[PDB]
Scaffold this active site. Structure first.
Site, PDB file in Angstrom:
ATOM      1  N   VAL A   1      -0.540  -1.103   6.305  1.00  0.00           N
ATOM      2  CA  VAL A   1       0.231  -1.796   7.056  1.00  0.00           C
ATOM      3  C   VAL A   1       1.409  -1.193   7.611  1.00  0.00           C
ATOM      4  O   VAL A   1       2.415  -0.713   7.019  1.00  0.00           O
ATOM      5  CB  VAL A   1       0.394  -3.160   6.677  1.00  0.00           C
ATOM      6  CG1 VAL A   1       1.404  -3.886   7.247  1.00  0.00           C
ATOM      7  CG2 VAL A   1      -0.906  -3.656   6.684  1.00  0.00           C
TER       8      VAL A   1
ATOM      9  N   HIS B   1      -2.863  -2.072  -1.100  1.00  0.00           N
ATOM     10  CA  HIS B   1      -2.225  -3.393  -1.905  1.00  0.00           C
ATOM     11  C   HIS B   1      -2.487  -4.364  -1.098  1.00  0.00           C
ATOM     12  O   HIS B   1      -1.933  -4.917   0.039  1.00  0.00           O
ATOM     13  CB  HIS B   1      -0.910  -3.383  -2.395  1.00  0.00           C
ATOM     14  CG  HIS B   1      -0.494  -2.211  -2.934  1.00  0.00           C
ATOM     15  ND1 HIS B   1       0.749  -1.749  -2.842  1.00  0.00           N
ATOM     16  CD2 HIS B   1      -1.208  -1.425  -3.820  1.00  0.00           C
ATOM     17  CE1 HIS B   1       0.831  -0.604  -3.675  1.00  0.00           C
ATOM     18  NE2 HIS B   1      -0.407  -0.503  -4.521  1.00  0.00           N
TER      19      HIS B   1
ATOM     20  N   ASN C   1       4.577   1.378   3.418  1.00  0.00           N
ATOM     21  CA  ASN C   1       5.053   0.112   3.996  1.00  0.00           C
ATOM     22  C   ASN C   1       6.503   0.354   4.655  1.00  0.00           C
ATOM     23  O   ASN C   1       6.996  -0.717   5.384  1.00  0.00           O
ATOM     24  CB  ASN C   1       4.955  -1.220   3.412  1.00  0.00           C
ATOM     25  CG  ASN C   1       3.199  -1.091   2.804  1.00  0.00           C
ATOM     26  OD1 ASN C   1       3.000  -1.272   1.568  1.00  0.00           O
ATOM     27  ND2 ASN C   1       2.444  -0.979   3.879  1.00  0.00           N
TER      28      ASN C   1
ATOM     29  N   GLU D   1      -2.457  -3.318  -6.602  1.00  0.00           N
ATOM     30  CA  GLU D   1      -3.519  -2.009  -6.996  1.00  0.00           C
ATOM     31  C   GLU D   1      -4.795  -2.888  -6.650  1.00  0.00           C
ATOM     32  O   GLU D   1      -5.321  -3.901  -7.355  1.00  0.00           O
ATOM     33  CB  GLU D   1      -3.725  -1.231  -8.177  1.00  0.00           C
ATOM     34  CG  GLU D   1      -2.348  -0.914  -8.739  1.00  0.00           C
ATOM     35  CD  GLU D   1      -1.767   0.153  -7.778  1.00  0.00           C
ATOM     36  OE1 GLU D   1      -2.243   1.236  -7.716  1.00  0.00           O
ATOM     37  OE2 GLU D   1      -0.657  -0.086  -6.794  1.00  0.00           O
TER      38      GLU D   1
ATOM     39  N   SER E   1       0.739  -0.975   0.109  1.00  0.00           N
ATOM     40  CA  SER E   1      -0.040  -0.031   0.109  1.00  0.00           C
ATOM     41  C   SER E   1       0.737   1.325  -0.170  1.00  0.00           C
ATOM     42  O   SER E   1       1.961   1.481   0.450  1.00  0.00           O
ATOM     43  CB  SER E   1      -0.928   0.082   1.221  1.00  0.00           C
ATOM     44  OG  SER E   1      -1.532  -1.398   1.314  1.00  0.00           O
TER      45      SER E   1
END
Lengths: 154, 522
Positions: free
Chosen positions: B70, B23, B244, B455, B1
């Site tokens: 995350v 993601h 991330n 994506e 992500s």
């Protein structure tokens, strides 16, 4: 400088678009949450029901060996019971939003039983606590403490 | 992500910009996103959330919006127990387990169930599990006492001001995630969020391993409040990001360093090439329009080629094998972009798998190591070019076996296929440097591959008045059998042809294809 004038719904309706995106208009909070439940059930009902089933700790019971280890993981960590606690611990207003969301799912399924896969029918009806129990599994027992890190499978 | 928020000063028009860009697996059912719009007389929220969640985690509206990535917040501890005399050794003495007799039903082949007994044992730490290898392990999960996760998100995403937003975030009911915020008033925020145990000793690595379960020394009981966590609001850089990476370059110039926080919160590992590009794409650009911001999101540079091919190519041309030589020239001529027409990209990926591991995160091959003092230009170079040429040799073999040639077009092997829709892929692996991510599967016997992950929900919002936003969902808004709304967006994804997101009533009405009147009574 102020934002554009906010919209005041006079009726409860979902206006879906050409891509199957629900625009849910409620006259109050539980109404929008109910609409949202309806919509999610239409677009994703089968897998939502399966997941709620699992977070009840009923995976093994509803669906056999393939679901047993997630069942052992969630029972051992007292997830379904804790979700009942968290549900009782909700604020009255928000708990009412959750009951409404759950009511939306149940209502979609009742009005459209053909759309619900035979194997997840046994999960209905779903409750506010189901909704809390799934979110609780997702955050704390998939994201934060995954079964793999504890059991040493990855 | 990926997550970007951009302050008005950095934009042409003077309105903040926000990117939501999670993601996750395209197949894992609980990871499936759903897009929706909720409107009442008192609130409005637009965006995506994981199925079965009653609140929108990736939300925006006319005033504000947020997005998530995350962060791996270590909110649990696994303890190795020392078993002795039916109990466990703890602070020099044997301590009996708590135990309850539970049971569950297990569906049989013939549709009946059997009741199976399940003993649940616990230590002071928490529930005890036995590993396949015999290790007794107790798990202690923080925040078992925060029933307010959903309501917090709800109050966060319907916040009337940033203070209200922050007040809601400060409840500490959401146990994880980087969370990025922006609004029409011009505030942008990045928070390294979660429920983190207060510990007296130990770095993050210590707390991710099996912590000893024989001493109260390690049995934490308290957790950090919000203002102990890394956070950034309206930095002089005029943007925040997270891809991330550890939270040490959330903006540029940075506003803090690792020393400012307890060492068990975040790792201090080399930032991924994707994360390095994230910082570059925001810092190097100014006077941003929403159009330009969207164009920047599509970045698919093979940053790893930039770091390695200058040393690799000349070393490769030295090799007596003509096919190695040809491989070197193919790589040399490549513009270093993961485009559909690229004849070199697949070959490069196969080499990088050997050079940097199957995940492409390996560091031992580089000549100059990563350094937080050069966080977007290290690591760099090839440490042992002779070994790396041997890796090319193997990689040439692997590429031909996987794909039929060393020069098959990237977009010919790399397809996005949903139902009867089959369109060319572009972009690729985040760890190779590609900002827009498609984590391609291994190929089938025909050398064809599809995204396992990448994506999914993608939106970019300008907090103008009215707001203006665009988005796509890779795998559509539905997954029900027989739906026409599973594969109806992937073709637009292949061309990066974004849907205008419709928030205004007039727009919704113009676009409506189905009305479902409803009525709720409790």
């Amino acid at each position: 400088q102020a934002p554009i004038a906010a919209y005041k719904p006079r009726s409860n309706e979902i206006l879906w678009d050409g891509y199957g995106v629900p625009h849910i208009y409620g006259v109050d909070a539980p109404s929008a949450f109910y609409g949202y439940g309806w919509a999610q059930a239409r677009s994703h009902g089968d897998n939502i029901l399966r997941l709620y089933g699992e977070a009840r700790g009923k995976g093994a019971e509803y669906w056999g060996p393939d679901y047993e280890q997630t069942t052992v993981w969630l029972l051992t960590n007292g997830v379904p019971e804790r979700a009942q606690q968290w549900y009782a611990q909700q604020s009255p207003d928000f708990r009412a939003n959750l009951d409404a969301f759950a009511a939306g799912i149940n209502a979609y399924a009742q009005q459209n039983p053909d759309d619900i896969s035979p194997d997840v029918r046994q999960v209905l009806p779903v409750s506010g606590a189901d909704v809390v129990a799934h979110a609780h599994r997702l955050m704390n027992f998939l994201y934060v403490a995954s079964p793999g890190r504890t059991l040493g499978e990855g | 992500s990926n997550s970007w928020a951009v302050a008005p000063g950095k934009t042409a028009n003077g309105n903040a910009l926000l990117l939501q860009n999670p993601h996750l697996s395209w197949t894992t059912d609980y990871f499936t996103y759903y897009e929706a719009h909720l409107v009442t007389p008192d609130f409005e929220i637009y965006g995506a959330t994981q199925i079965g969640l009653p609140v929108i985690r990736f939300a925006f509206n006319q005033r504000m919006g947020i997005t998530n990535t995350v962060n791996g917040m270590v909110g649990a501890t696994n303890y190795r127990l020392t078993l002795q005399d039916g109990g466990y050794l703890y602070d020099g003495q044997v301590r009996p387990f708590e135990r309850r007799q539970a049971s569950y039903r297990l569906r049989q082949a013939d549709g009946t169930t059997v009741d199976k007994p399940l003993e649940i044992r616990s230590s002071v730490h928490g529930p005890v599990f036995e590993r396949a290898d015999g290790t007794a392990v107790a798990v202690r999960v923080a925040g078992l006492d925060r029933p307010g996760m959903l309501e917090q998100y709800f109050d966060m995403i319907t916040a009337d001001s940033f203070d209200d937003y922050e007040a809601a975030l400060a409840r500490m009911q959401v146990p994880t995630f980087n969370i990025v915020y922006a609004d029409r008033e011009g505030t942008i925020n990045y928070s390294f969020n979660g429920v983190a145990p207060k510990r007296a000793e130990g770095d993050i690595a210590f707390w991710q391993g099996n912590v000893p379960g024989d001493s109260s020394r390690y049995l934490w009981t308290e957790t950090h409040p919000l203002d102990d966590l890394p956070r950034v609001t309206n930095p002089p850089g005029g943007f925040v990001q997270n891809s991330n990476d550890p939270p040490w370059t959330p903006t540029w110039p940075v506003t803090y360093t690792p020393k400012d926080f307890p060492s068990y919160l975040a790792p201090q590992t080399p930032h991924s090439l994707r994360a390095q590009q994230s910082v570059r794409l925001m810092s190097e650009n100014d006077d941003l329009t929403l159009e330009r911001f969207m164009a920047l999101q599509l970045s698919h540079r093979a940053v790893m080629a930039d770091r390695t091919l200058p040393d690799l190519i000349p070393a490769a041309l030295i090799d007596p094998d003509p096919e190695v030589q040809a491989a070197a020239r193919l790589l040399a001529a490549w513009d270093r972009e993961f485009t559909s027409d690229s004849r070199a990209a697949l070959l490069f990926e196969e080499w990088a798998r050997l050079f940097a591991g199957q995940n492409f995160a390996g560091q031992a091959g580089f000549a100059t190591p990563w350094s937080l003092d050069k966080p977007v230009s290290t690591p760099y170079g090839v440490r042992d070019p002779k070994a790396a040429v041997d890796q090319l040799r193997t990689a040439i073999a692997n590429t031909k076996r996987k794909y039929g040639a060393i020069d098959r077009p990237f977009g010919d092997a790399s397809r996005m296929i949903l139902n009867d829709v089959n369109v060319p892929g572009a972009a690729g692996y985040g760890n190779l440097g590609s900002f827009r991510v498609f984590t391609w599967s291994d190929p089938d016997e025909n050398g064809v591959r599809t995204p396992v992950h990448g994506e999914t929900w993608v939106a970019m919002i300008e907090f103008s008045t009215p707001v203006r936003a665009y988005g796509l969902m890779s795998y559509g808004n539905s997954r029900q059998p027989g739906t026409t709304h599973y594969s109806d967006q992937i073709e637009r994804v292949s061309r990066a042809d974004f849907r205008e997101l419709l928030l205004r009533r007039e727009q919704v009405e113009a676009a409506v294809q189905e009305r479902t009147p409803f009525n709720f009574k409790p």
